[PDB]
Structures are given as structure tokens and as C-alpha cells.
Amino acid sequence: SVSVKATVTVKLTVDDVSDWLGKTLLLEVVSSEVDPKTGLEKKPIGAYAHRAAEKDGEVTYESDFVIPDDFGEIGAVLVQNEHHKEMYLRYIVLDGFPNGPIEFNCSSWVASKFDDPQKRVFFTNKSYLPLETPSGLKEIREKELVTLRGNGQGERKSYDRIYDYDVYDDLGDPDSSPELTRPVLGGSKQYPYPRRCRTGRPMSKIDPKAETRSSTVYVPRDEAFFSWFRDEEFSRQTLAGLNPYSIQLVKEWPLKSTLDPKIYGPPESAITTEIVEREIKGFMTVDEALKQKKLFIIDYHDILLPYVSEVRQIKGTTLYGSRALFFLGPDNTLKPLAIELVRPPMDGKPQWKQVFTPSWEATGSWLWKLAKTHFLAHDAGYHQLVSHWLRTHCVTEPYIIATNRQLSAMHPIYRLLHPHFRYTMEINALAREALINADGIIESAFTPGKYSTEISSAAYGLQWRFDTQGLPADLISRGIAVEDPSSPHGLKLAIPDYPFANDGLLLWDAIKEWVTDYVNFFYKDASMVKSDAELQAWWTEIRTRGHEDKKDETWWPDLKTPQDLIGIVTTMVWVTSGHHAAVNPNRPTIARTNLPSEDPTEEGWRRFLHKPENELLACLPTQLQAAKVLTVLDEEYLGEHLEPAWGADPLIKAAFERFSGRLKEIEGIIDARNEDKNLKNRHGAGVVPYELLKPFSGVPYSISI
Amino acid sequence: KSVSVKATVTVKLDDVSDWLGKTLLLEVVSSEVDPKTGLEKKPIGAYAHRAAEKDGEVTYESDFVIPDDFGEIGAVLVQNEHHKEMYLRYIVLDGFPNGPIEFNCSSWVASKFDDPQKRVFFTNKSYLPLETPSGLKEIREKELVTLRGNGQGERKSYDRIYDYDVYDDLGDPDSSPELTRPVLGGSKQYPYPRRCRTGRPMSKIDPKAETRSSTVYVPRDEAFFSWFRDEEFSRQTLAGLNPYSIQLVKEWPLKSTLDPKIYGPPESAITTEIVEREIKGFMTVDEALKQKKLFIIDYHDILLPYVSEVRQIKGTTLYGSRALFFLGPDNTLKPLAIELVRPPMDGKPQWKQVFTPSWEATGSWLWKLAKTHFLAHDAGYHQLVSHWLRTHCVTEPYIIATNRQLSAMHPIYRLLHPHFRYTMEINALAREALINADGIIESAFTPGKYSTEISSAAYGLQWRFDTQGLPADLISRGIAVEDPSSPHGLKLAIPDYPFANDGLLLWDAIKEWVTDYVNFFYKDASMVKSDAELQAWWTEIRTRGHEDKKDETWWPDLKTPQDLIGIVTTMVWVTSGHHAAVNFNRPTIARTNLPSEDPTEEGWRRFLHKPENELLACLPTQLQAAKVLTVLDVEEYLGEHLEPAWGADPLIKAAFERFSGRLKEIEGIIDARNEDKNLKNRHGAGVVPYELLKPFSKGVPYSISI
Ligand SMILES: [Fe+3]
């Protein structure tokens, strides 16, 4: 009774002799309603689609069939690829109804039926919680989730769309040499770690706990593709550089190591009140500075000192546990006070510990430059492995796996999360292949060498917790902020001109208001959150499987109210857009020689005095290592593009326009801040404007690099 | 009977035919007059003949006969028979029962067609005028008369005539009225030391200007970015090429002496508050003053009167400037502040700002730009005052008076002579191409065409003979106080001060050599006062060579041996020690104003966006640096060579050996100091060892030789 033309749009990219001629695709429409007489699903109705037109890398397939006028609203379309090669389906359009066309967004590779004979399903752009699902779609919605989970076994093939978890047992290459054997990260008290996508390749015969290496790493198919010589620029970079996440408030004094003195030597810092007051007493005493929150620190001592011994056995690198202390001065800019470098007892020698400060005599000033060199190598490694790799790439992949395993593609929270997870799993597979692997790029150019990835595991174990990954909680956790209802964004900042925090809190508020509007459209109260079985499964799986090694921690948010959900989703989206943008180049990634003042010989010391430039070049990365890191630095912006389903709900579309507008407003706010003579951490002679968090030239919406 | 004398003249390498065919007339002159008449004895000699040649040397030989009653030979006469001059090294007389007699010559002897007058050379024995052997008294006087000339005529290249004139030869008003320069010397407005008279025509355009020439006469025998680092900026005030400017801060707050009716408020903008922000973790400002921990390089009052006119020159600017330093507990200097001042001009108020090391980008860049201006000022002052004025320029009048008034036979002439070598010729070259209108200095230094005038201002306002000796200079600047129990009898407020520490070693060694030498010839005050040559010498220095200061009461008296030792030790220090320390890099000009001086919105924005571009626009151009560094690219040393008269006298020779040994000692002391980890102003990471005053090679020459 109803004639329907189905049009499929396919994108071109570069056994086929026996392709079924003129029957490339089988298309079947699915009714939204069960047969009201029996309660069972109606049979899908369909026909084959043949090639119809090619224009500029785009191919049309057409199918013509008849549907009874009581079939019901079409809520989904089933597709089978009859030919031997996969095809990329853009979208499907159903013409011929009196209600106008229906678009189905596909954006998917459809495997050859000879690789996978299961039919693919595409739902309309209308989104539903599970209990609100039209009765004709309930079982196919569930069956599709089952398909994406797979069954936990098998070597994953390129055409698979199977999402599941496995530990990091694929970074070493014991089959090439035992020297390339690396510990498994994940599944143990000593090496806790987020899980990654399961690949299922055979385990190695030389190292049984290792998964064999491969030149191709599976992801589910649709996931595939010297300024610091200036003390004031060294300091400003802690607030507006690429690693704005390390600086924290000094509360205790004197500074004291938490490590075991019986293994690590005296725990008390060598930074004294006398050293600091010689520098700042023209403004205030140390006691006043502590009370008035003017002392700030980047403290890598306790995390790095337990690795010093192992790392020092590696030719061409060294290590110290380090601290960098800063005074917040009268222009609200940071002044470097001191750098402390510590070697623990090793090789019959006691703990070695020295403090370096800015200096107006030549030797002290050269030791200061070398001290900054070591500290900057530590901060470069911490930035790359923790601020960047761990806290964006690594911890996010389990969220992506869980999203595809437990949230239907027609679930509203799936469609909110979806664009913020694009390209990450593939980038992460590339990182396991060539960045964080044994003798990969990090190990060969960074201070910790083969111990680098283990250090990210220690940072995960000791420090990572979901509830401080949102920007307010992170600032609060570091002593930079306290809650204050009057103050802008509800936060009083001890560092008021903190370009990363200032611009980030604008982005954070806009994202949160968008997530709030979006959640409130679909979840009207707590009972709708509590009764969402896909949502509950998703959050339970993230904690108990994706982050299994921390599943018993008490800091995991509950998921019982719309506000709980808003908090979880805002955190995830912030991480994939703003956090990642803020951590994406003069700094050394490795310091290859010890300080000249570390157990000097008479003639080693004299060589340093005679040619300290040579000592600096011996410490700095080789021009090859630097050329390695730099050359290794290899879509649309946040707020530019509507997802098909957002644009289909008029209220969701309106919320997105308000989001886009706030982002544009923030662009103008940031541009004005970069012109403000009072914001000396972003405006000043030679000071590059702070634009890392500026929308629209730009903030990406996902971790794509 | 009689004695057979073999006279041998050694000559260093005119047309060939005259060269080989003509020779010399050599005569010997008795030391004593005829004892029966008081009359001079006629000299005796004969014409020479070529005897030997080797290694660039020709030897002429004269053989003649002398009466046995002739007496001791006190001189030889030489008459060149070539029609070209000839350089005589030394003369030896053989055949006397007592042995050879050597006469040192070291003198060009003119062609007889230029000057037919015979040349006289005295033996190596030295005499005060009253001790001159009777046969030599007249010739000793006649020689001085010859060397003075008559004050007239254009001097020619074969002349041996020493006399004075003003610096009226630096401009070129025969090219442009813009190349006119004021006469330096002889007026209240432009006091200056005199220079050697050349006697060329005066300009018809500018009648007070001597006409320019490509050849300048001298008497014939006179002719031949580290500071980006604050720690090196401040260390160079003590161990760099201009260690002469730093002074103790005496008054607080700082205040100009210039008339406020013309130059604006005199109070410095450097305040207690600014300094206390930097040093309170060490001590209060009040205690830093009381404990002599605050030091300054203060060019404000000498430079401020030139600022208005220098700023009218395209491509440069000027401020009056001060740089303030704090001596910390490791006895290293921390720079505190730079003050830059513009006087009221163009109906605008005095502009005055202070710059300090800073904890934020804009203040840090402004500090670097202010360092750039002050360093250009320090460079100009070093070049024009510490170097040109205080060594070259004030010394030339001593050289003129020495030749006009001290006999070549006089012991003090023979003490001074090596320390005066090459200076007159170099100074001539400077008048020709360095301090002349549109010369190297005017073209590459901040003051432009006002550069030489500023050296005249420094001479008129600051130069005094009695503070040119090193102890007096350090006491004058507040660096030292007299203290019997301290080394050299001076307690230094900057104890690690490489120039001063090393310089005081040199000073004492020179002073005891001069003391030994003077005491050999002047046994009491009566011998100093009755020395008519020495008195005329000192009178000519004060009333002619330094005529514009003739009335100052700080001129040393010259009545006692100790007066003479003071005077000569000062002169020798200046020609050797002082010159070595400032001669053997920084910008010489800063071409644009500080960005913070009357900024416009767009000018300020440009500076913020590209400060490195602003630095380059301020710094010297590549040509200006080339001219300087190419010119700045251009003999034996102190304690190395005995003068002939010094070797001739056993006690003086012994005194020189002690002098030489002390200098060798001082070398080892200085090498030890450059390895002392406690002496952070000369030893440290990347610190070049301080060797400018190290005897026996950067080398202490005995004279201002370059
Ligand atoms: Fe990344």
C-alpha cells in the first residue's frame, strides 16, 4: 500500500569477480511496534539495492519496495553487504512516505557478509532510554549490544566490531630480545593501570605473560582512521605552559619526604627558611608567605626517588628526585626560589642532597641553569606520561569500551558521549605500537628510559581518582582553589592570574550547562536514572572492569540522580576536550649527565669551570633525540558541528546553539584577557598570548592526537 | 804620547749610489775643558768607511788619533754625509787602556741636505745639570735649545722639534660647517691638555682651525651578549676593561649637583624602598650604607648637560645615568637599579625612571634595554675618559716637556724615556682618524660629534694629577681607606677587586724601583731644588702642557726626593699599569629611547609584541660594530729589557733586577689568585681569569703603545 524508495549513500576509499550482480546491499525496514495482536515483532520487509550513480567518490544504491499502510513507523533499518569488500555507508534515506523522508545516519563500515554474516542495524535519530524504547525495537536494541560485547575470546579481526578489555601486556617485545621484556601494567597491586581494548593475539613463547607483537593492532572497525633561561618564563610556564597541572600550594613547612628514611636517607628538605628569606624578605617573611598562600611548589621528589637507582643503571641518562619552589610576588607572577635535587643512598654512598637558587655569581648561576635542566626533564616526562598520556588517553579508553558495550547507539548518553571519543582508541593503539612500547619513542628520548611507562602506572596507583579529574576538584585538590559562592565560578584562586585555570573554568562551566540541559531533557528525576539498566551497567563496568585495579576505592561517584550523571559526563567531556587541549616546545625531555657538584673530582670540576657550555650540551638531549621528539609531534572544534541526533530534537538543538554561543563568547573573553596589562602571566613584552583553551581558533572535542 | 781610537758605528737598514758611496763623520768630545784656559777642547775624529754588513746592519768604521791629555770622552758627534736619513743604533770606541766605551744612539740622523748640524750622543753615565763634566755643559744646553725650536714654522718629517699646541686640528670646516669642532684647550669652556705642535696653515674658512693633512708630524724619533647576565654585568665593574668608574655611595638619598633652574629636580628616584625590596633579606638599607655595601657608577651629572644637544643627532640619544650595586656577603656585587634621566627640554618636564631586575616579562625587558643604555654610556666613558683622556691625552705633554727641558744625559729623562715610546705617534693617528670630525668614535659612539667635548668636560671637572696614582684613586672613589695594618696600608671596602688587588702589587713594585732610582741621584732636598732642568720640566708641565689647570692647588710640589718619587711613579703607573688595565664586547651606542619614555599606544604595542626587534633597533648597527672592532683590533714589557744607561750603572742594574724579580713574583701571585675559589670576581664557571695586569704576558707594556 506504500511504495518506498530507499537510497543509500556510500563513500569510496582505496573474490570480487563473483560479486552478486546488481544485488550489492540487502536493506530491510523494521517497524517500531510489535504486532498488537500477538505481542511479537513484525517481520522486517526488504529488497536488494543496486548501484545507481557515482559522483566524486560517492556511490548511490537504490532499493524499491512496498510496505503495508499498517506496518507502523519505521524505527530501524537492517543492512547486509552481499559483496566481498567492506563498504562505508554514509546515510540511508527512505522516501515515499506522506510524513516526508526519513534519514538514518550510518557513518559506518559494513563488513562483507563473508567476513560477518550478521545484519547491521541503524536506528533513527530519535533517542530513548531503555524503558522508553518502542516495543518493536526492544529486542534488536539488546541484541546489538550483545554483538558489540563479543564473547571474550578469539583473536580480533580487522572487520570485528567487538569491544572488550585486556591489560597492558603488549608493550614489550620479548620475542626480539629478553632486553625488551616489560612488566604487565594492570591487574596487580604493584602495577595498577586502566585496561585497554582486547586484541586477543597469541601469547608469547619466550615471555608467557606477554601478548605477541604485531605490525597491525586491532581496534573495532569504526574506530579506525631556550626561553626557560629566563627565570620569569620558566615560572610563567607552570601557569600557562603545556603542563599547567603540576603546581600546588605549600601548606607544610619545612618540606618533608614521606619516604622511608631507612631506605631513602633523611626525609627533611634542604630548602631552609634562611635560603627563602634571603630572596623574599623585602616583601615578607616565610611565615607570612605560608599563611598568605604565596609559596607554591612542583614536587616530583617522592614519585621519582624510588626509581633513581634503577634509572641510573641506564647508559646515557640519570635521575634525581626533585622539587621546584616558587614565590607568588607583587605582580601576581611567580618567582623561582629554589630547585632541590636528591639522590638516595646507593653504592655505599649516603643520600646526596643539594639546593640551587637564582644567583648573581657565575658558578651558582651555572649550577642553577643545570638544575633547571634536570627539573625540566622531569617535568617534561611527567607531562608526557601522566598529565598527558595517563590522564587523557589511557584512563579514557575504558570509558569508550564501556560506552559501546553497554549504551545502545540510540541511548541519549551514547549520542552525547560519542563525538568526544572519536579517534582515541586508534591513537592509543598507535601509542602501544610505537610510543610507549619497549625501545619506542618515549623510552629512547626521555629521562626514565625503560622505566617510563612504569612511572605512569605509579602515578595511576598513588594519585589517580575519578573525582579529582574535573577542573574544580583538581584545582581544589592542589590547594590552588577553595570553594567561595561569591567569587567567579564559585572558586577563590590563590593564584588569581592563572591562565589555564581562568580559561579552563569558563570552558568547564559552559560544558556543564550543556550537559545539564541534555541530561535534564531525558532524565526527569532520580528514579529514571536508577531504573536505566543500560546506564547502571555502563557505570558499573567502567569501575569494576575498565578501572578494575581501583574498583574498591571509596571515591567513586554514585549514579543515582540526574546531578550524579551530569557530574560524571562533564568530567569525561572536560578531559577529552579542555584537559587534552591544555597539554597539547623548548623543554629538554632528558638530562644526560649528573650535576657537576655531585661528588665532583678535582679535574671534573675544573673542566666544568673552564667550559660550562660544554657541560650543558653534554646534559641536554642530543640533536638526534630532540629531532626525534619534535618530528614525532605528528577535526572540527568543540561547538561547531551538530551531531545528527542533536539536530533532530528541536530542544537539544537549541541547547547546542546556546553552547556554541557561550563558546564564542569565551573566545572574546579570552582575547580580551590576552590584551589585559594586569594579567602579566599572559600579557607582557615577548609573552605569547594564552590561546590553548580558545574556542574557534581551537579546542578539539576529542582526543585525536 | 797619543792613543789610537777605533770608532765603530752600527746602522740599521735612499738611492743605491749615495747609499754605498757616502759615509759618516765621527768626532769625539772631551769631558773636560782645557784646564789652563777653561776653554772647550776641539773635537777630534775622521770620516768613516763601510766596514761590515750582516743581518740588516751596516757598520761604519773611523780610525783616528787622540792626545794622551785629551781627557775622558764624554760624547761623540755624528754628521751624516748621505743625502738621506740613517738610523744609528750604537757606537763603540776601541783602543783605550781602560777598554771600550759604548754610546747608545737609537736615533735617526738626518740627511745633511736637510739639517747640516752634527748630532751629539752622550755616554751612558747620567748627570744632574750641576754635575755635568765641564766639557759637556755647553753642548748639553745647546741640545735642549735645538729640541725646543723657536715656536714657528710648519714642522717637517726630519725635524726633532717638541712644542705645544691646542687641539684645533680635529674638525674639517674646509669640507662642511657641520664638520666644525670647538677648539679643545685654552679656554674656560673647553679645558684640555696640549698636544705636539705641527704648525700647518690655518683655515681661511675657520681661522681658529688648523688645516687638515693626510700626514701628521711627530718629531722624527717619535715615529714608528655576556652582559645579559646580571652577574657578568656587575663583575666587569671590578675585573673588566673599565674598572675605574665604581665608587662608594656616600650620600643618601642620591642627589644631583646640577642647577635645578635648568636641569629639573635633583633628587634621584632611586629610593630606600626600591633597594630594600632587593636586599632586606641581607640587611637594611641604613646598615648597607653604614657598612659600605652600596656602590655606584654615576654618569648623571657629567652626561645630563649634553642630553639635549646629543638628542638632535639622527641615530642616537642620551640620558644621564646611574647604576647602583649591592656588595653581598660573598663579596660579589648584585646589581640593584639603573636610573635614566632626561632634563627638561622642549617645554617638557624632567623625565626620570628607575629600572631593576624584575620578576615579570615587561620589567625584565625594560631592565635589559636600560642596561643597554648604561653600557653604551660606560663604553663611551671608558673609551673617551678612562682610556683616551687619562692615558694618551694627559701623557703627551709630559713627553714634550721631557724632551724640551730634560737633557738626554739627565737621569730622570733616562728613567722616563721607555715609558713614553710610541705615544706621540699613536696620539697623532688618533687626531687623524679616531677623535676627528666624522671619525671612528663620532660615528659609532652615543655622543656623536659631542664625544671629544665630553672628554674635555671630564678633564675640566674631574682630572687632577694627585689622584692619578692608584692608592689616591682608590681613596678618592671611597674604595680604600688608609690603614697601617692592612696590605699596602689600604683597607679595601671591596676586598675581591681584581684590578685593585693586582694593581696595588704593580704600584708598590714600580714605586720601590723609582725610589731606588731617585735615591741614587738625589741625596737630599737641596739637590732637587737646585736641579734647574728638573724644575723647568715640572714648571712646563703645569704651566704649558696642562696650562688650563695651571692654577690648581693639587699640583705636587717638587722640593724633595720623595716629591719626585711620587710624580714619576704616577707617570710610570699611568703609562704601564693604568693603560694595560683599560686597553688590552659592550655596545658603544644605544640608538633609540627607552620604550617607557613618553610611549604611544602603537609604539608600546610594537615593543610588547616584538621586544627583540626593539633591542636590535637600539643596539649598534653591524657597520658601527665593524668599525669599532676592526679599529679595536690594533714591543717589550715592563721588567724585561734594561735601558742601556740602566745596565751601565752597577747599582741601578741591580735595582732593575730586583724590580724584574718582583714582577715575576707578582705573576705567580696573580696566577694563584686566578685559581682561588674564594675570589669569585676572577674565578668561577665560565669566568675568564683576570690577567690584564699580569707581568710577562695579557702583558703590561712599559708605555702607551697602542
Ligand atoms: Fe594526545
Ligand SMILES: [Fe+3]
Ligand atoms: Fe691606548
